Design a protein around this ligand. Sequence first.
Ligand SMILES: COC1=C(OC)C(=O)C(C/C=C(\C)CC/C=C(\C)CC/C=C(\C)CC/C=C(\C)CCC=C(C)C)=C(C)C1=O
Ligand code: SF4
Ligand code: SF4
Ligand code: SF4
Lengths: 199, 157, 150, 286, 64, 267, 262, 134
Amino acid sequence: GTERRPGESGAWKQIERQRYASDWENDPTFKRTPKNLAEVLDDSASMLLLTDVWRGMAYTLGAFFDKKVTIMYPFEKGQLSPRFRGEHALRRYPTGEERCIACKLCEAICPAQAITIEAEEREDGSRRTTRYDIDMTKCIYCGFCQEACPVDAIVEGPNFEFSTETREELLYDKQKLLENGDKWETEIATNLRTESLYR
Amino acid sequence: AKGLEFVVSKVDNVVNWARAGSIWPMTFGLACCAVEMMHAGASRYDLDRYGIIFRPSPRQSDAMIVAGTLTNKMAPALRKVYDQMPEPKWVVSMGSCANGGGYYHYSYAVVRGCDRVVPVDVYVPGCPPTAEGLLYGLLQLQKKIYRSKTTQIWYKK
Amino acid sequence: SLSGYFSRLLEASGKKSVGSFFASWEFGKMLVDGNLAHNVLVRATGAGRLVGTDYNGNRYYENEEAAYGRRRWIVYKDKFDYNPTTIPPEWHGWLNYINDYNPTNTQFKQPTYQIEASMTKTGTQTCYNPKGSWFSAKPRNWRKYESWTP
Amino acid sequence: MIVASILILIVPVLLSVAMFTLAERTVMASMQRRFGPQVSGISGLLQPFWDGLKLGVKEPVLPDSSSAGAFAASPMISFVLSQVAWVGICISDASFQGLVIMAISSLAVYGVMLAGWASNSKYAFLGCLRSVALMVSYELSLGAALLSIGLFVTDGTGMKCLNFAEMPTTPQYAMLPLCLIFLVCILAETKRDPFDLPGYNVEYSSLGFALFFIAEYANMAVMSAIASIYFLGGFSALKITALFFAFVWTRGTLPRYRYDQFMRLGWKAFLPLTLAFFALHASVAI
Amino acid sequence: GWNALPSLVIITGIWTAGLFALDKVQMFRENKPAWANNKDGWQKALYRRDWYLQREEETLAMAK
Amino acid sequence: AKVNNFTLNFGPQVLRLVLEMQGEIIMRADPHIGLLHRGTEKLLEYKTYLQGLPYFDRLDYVSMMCMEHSYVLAIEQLLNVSVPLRGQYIRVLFSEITRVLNHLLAITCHSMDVGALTPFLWAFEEREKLFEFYERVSGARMHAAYFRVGGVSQDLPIGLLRDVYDWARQFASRLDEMEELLTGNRIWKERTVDVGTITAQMAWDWGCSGPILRASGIDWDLRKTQPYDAYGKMQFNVPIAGHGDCYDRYLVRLQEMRESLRIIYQC
Amino acid sequence: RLQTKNWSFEDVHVDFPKRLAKLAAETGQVQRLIHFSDMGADENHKSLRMRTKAVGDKEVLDAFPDATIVRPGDIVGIEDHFYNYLIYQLTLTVFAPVVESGSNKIQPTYVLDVADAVAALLRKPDTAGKTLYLGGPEVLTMREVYDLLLKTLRIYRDDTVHLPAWAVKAMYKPFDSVRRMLPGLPMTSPLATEDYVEEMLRDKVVPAGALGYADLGIVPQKVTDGLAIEPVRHARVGGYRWGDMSAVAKDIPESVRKYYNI
Amino acid sequence: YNAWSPAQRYFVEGDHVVTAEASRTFQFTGLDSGSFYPYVIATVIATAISTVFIVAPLVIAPSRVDLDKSSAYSVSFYLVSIMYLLFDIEIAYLFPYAMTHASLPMYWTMNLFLAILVAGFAYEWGMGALEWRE
Ligand SMILES: COC1=C(OC)C(=O)C(C/C=C(\C)CC/C=C(\C)CC/C=C(\C)CC/C=C(\C)CCC=C(C)C)=C(C)C1=O
Ligand code: SF4
Ligand code: SF4
Ligand code: SF4
């Protein structure tokens, strides 16, 4: 219970105040003085012989005999959604041509300035990138680049397990991002078949 | 010669099994990433299941997890606490802020990566990384500890 | 039935007999790795059914009477160096509870450029490196102009 | 034969200390709806051994501003006193065995105070005095409890003693409140919850630290055996496990006191209660 | 939980086996299952007399 | 006598404190801050309004969408933008989910600092459930960037309200089993009762707000006095205590979790 | 510094520098080869390591003709092998042997000055093919070094004893005939060998007319006092510490004295 | 210890008793009742074990020299220590009482002893000396 007692007061000014004045008897949140013998025995069985520790002990012993919420990683996984923002990746058309057309919108929206793009025209006249870098140690994983892209070229895929031993392994260039897309293409397409109803 | 080299290789196997299965890290809960590290220690992921005990003092610490951004005001304190850990020790950089400055990379007050102050063994990416991603990074650090061969190197000196 | 337990143990471990199972190095690592020990000996031998197998050899199981978020699990074929980066993307969303699709009930569209999933190469010298790195076949000087050579 | 008996005693003490610290982790985990150590060996059964071997190949930090001898001597003194107290439990026939173990446990204060004097930390000096004050304050209630216990311990020839083999083999139902006070005094001596506010081994690494924790868990086992002898009708394996489970159970479910709070508890509650119970039992024993 | 059962069983088994072995060793040393009893001055006098008379019986046996 | 103060340095490891004591009694406390000052106010001048929005998730990173809310409302007022009804309801619902997450962490971290370890481990699994609710609508467990100028970023996926109702159906039981370990326990009371008392005049003079202000007997809730989005339609109570205690703040925070559950059910 | 059953002095000081100089000259793009040897290196030295070092210097200058040979004295630093073993000899031992009168002269130098010397060599093209001797601005004897360490450590009991060289070699002989057939043991001093005794019977200074720090434009730092002696001041009895700090705190402001509790 | 006189050996003559005593096994039921000798051997053995624990990481562990690794990371105690001293002396006095089968005048003498104890203790309680506010 939330009731107070003279003596259980954590400080000194209130401890000095409760033992020299009866101002605590006016306050309604205090427990009143016992009036007869049975109330004195109830108060003493509260203070001595504990019984407030025992309720918490009974609860924790019930929890000892209860079910557990631990998953056995990496044999068992957690739960995520198709909107999950993981490792960045670059995508292709089903023919095998890149979707990206070097519009530089994802580079403009990036609040971390984690994208660096250079481009010129390809030998068949197409508008394609020559450099597409993502500093993964500068990235904030917001997904704004995914929102800004008008051709669904850059995505954040469903991969979260990509920790490395050197920091140079986390400065992605264009070739590695295309390799990530070629790895994760079927899962990305399955996710985007649901998330295109909302976006 | 063949027998003693076999014994020395098994001494490395047992020592690496002990050191990877008894990592006691030190918490630098600087920022956002500390909450995901708390979630890693909680009942769902249970870092204590893998032998990980968080320790308050650097003298009993086997590893350092930098979980959050490092400022210019905090860098000498982090360096001093790193220097007080005994060998062998490892450093795990967690999240974009500790990895490379992250979202505060162009600020007047932030160290662009904890690499610039301490050497780092395993980098975990994200802002924040999930607790499960931090488990992946710690299992990778265990894999790095497994490939060490200390008594074999000492035997051939 | 203990015969059911041993049949489940042999189909999960991939061995041919209990003598071949207990005399293997996989059982030797299961004496020193308890995570693998629990996964093979308790979870894979319990209530549940086999769903499918990927091209890396990992087996996938499910149990609908379990708690939520503990219904699905994997038995890795690599017993000594098991890693979640060997799970193909057509099993990744099933095992991470993102969708309810796997190859046993869904025909995925396979692009002609698809690279199969394999274990990570970090920590070795065959990892990814940028083009200006020392470990590249030919390091780049990224100058944006041409110098005059007499 | 004495050296052989002592080594055959020493082996299960250290094996039991390793298994106690594992069982504390796992029972504390099960109360919190998780698992605890399972990966490190099958069912996690190698985790204390890999902790010990990890600390074995760990670098010993010897600070070059302290006195090296007292710094080395403090965990050695703690460990030696724990082992000697176990020998007094099992390889003695003395008349005042409980007084012997009380004298040994009164010596255990020195490791804390030598660690406080040796290491040049500002708050190690601050916390060692608090921990010593707590142990010193609850030793008196332990002594008065021993006075109440010894009023009824008589051997066959009629001599009153504190010999453990002469203690009765039935639980002492007449001394239930004194048993509860004894258990909370054990909790206070081992600096466990709810008295874990003071730490003193902040500068120790590797096997000096390991010696500190082996001494702490062995002292907990000593006090558990003493309580089972005095109140539970004998020393047994089941009683050791049950009392350890009770201590971990209390550590799972309770918060800790402030320094002045447990000082007021030990000097205004436990000491007058044990002395009043001694006077009542002396009145009964006439 | 089920994970806490093996360590708690092992503590009991360790203490049971260790106490059994220590009991057998000290029983071999003392040859009577009351060596740990309290002894006063009369009982100490009786044991010391018994030891010396046993030595005397051994000395007198190697003379016939 | 002429007793000088004994001073103490309290933790580089991100609060630094310089105390002064006259024995066992503190006479002064001076917090030294700026160990996490990353200059986000300067960096926001170099961003567009959409670019600078994810800075706000990283201010109070226990309560993210509530930090987003005020920045979005400030932009919307100057733009003279109206938010549609469903977006206002979604904003209120996720603001209350955010408040539940923050209060779970605050109470259990407080009780762990005092010494009780189990309520932390009990409450963080509920925190994991609410993180799954964040991730299913934004793809991020913490830094959602969900609230935007004029509404929210995406619609609610089909099947979210079903699961939020299934969590809210058992959350009161979780809060109940949380209070069995702390509320009627004498050690927690002896640590918290009459510690750090704040009166109303000191609360307003020192710019206080939130559950501190309600534990000193002040009826002031911004969701009832200056309402925003659809908070004026919501029916809930303001909890009031009158000692200004740590214990009273703990009770007010638990009741505020109950009231947030009530608003969640109404939404 | 010590021989092992897997590695001898010729393998490290002779064979590897020769093959390194050959493979360096094979590439064609290596413009500079900086090889490090010792100040006391001499082909007519009784100590084996000095002799193998001088032989390898000759092989390096033969195979790579523009390689620079650098010969510094004793190098002081936080992780050095000069003051650290001397402090481990003054403490942690019952007695510290000193070879003869301890009147052999040395010229110790600071590690940061050697690091600056490498960059100054890489700047100056004339230093290719030369040999440089790196020594500090003070010439000291071993007795003076021991006295400086005993004064700096604040030890009030001289535990050193001066011994004839045959007695020191007789002490170090049992742990030198067993140095092979052993993989190398931790905490073995490099001063517990006969080669150190032979080095102590000779001067190790900069020769007259040699190229030194001054030809590189470097004024070397003092080794006996200043920043170089600060690490050994941390190992004194009790601790480094400031002092009473009250004579100068007289006109210090208000919050500072209370902050330091003065 | 070995007996040095015929009276100490119960007047048993010969040389077999002298050698048999000097080479005897320790026995609590022979010549070594209540002996406290295993307490010394336990101290020696445990000191050996803890010394081996101290010395071993100086051989088989890595080590690096650093100047920062070798650096640092009320009157109520007087009350407690002196009060504990006096109360421990009083409990030591009370222990010979509890080890006797005491008669009634012994009981009343002991209660006078305890009364003087608790009167001084209650005076220090009433003057507010067991309130550890400072
Ligand atoms: C929350 O509480 C806890 C802590 O915080 C207070 C801890 O710190 C630790 C971690 C610390 C540990 C385990 C150190 C103390 C125990 C040790 C060193 C184990 C002692 C075991 C021994 C001596 C037997 C092992 C040796 C053998 C078998 C010999 C091997 C020999 C050969 C193979 C030849 C734990 C587990 C813990 O729960
Ligand atoms: S997710 Fe955010 S930080 Fe990463 S590239 Fe896209 S906009 Fe930049
Ligand atoms: S990835 Fe998309 S937004 Fe970025 S440059 Fe290419 S087409 Fe434009
Ligand atoms: S990386 Fe992101 S989540 Fe982690 S501390 Fe920095 S801003 Fe917070």
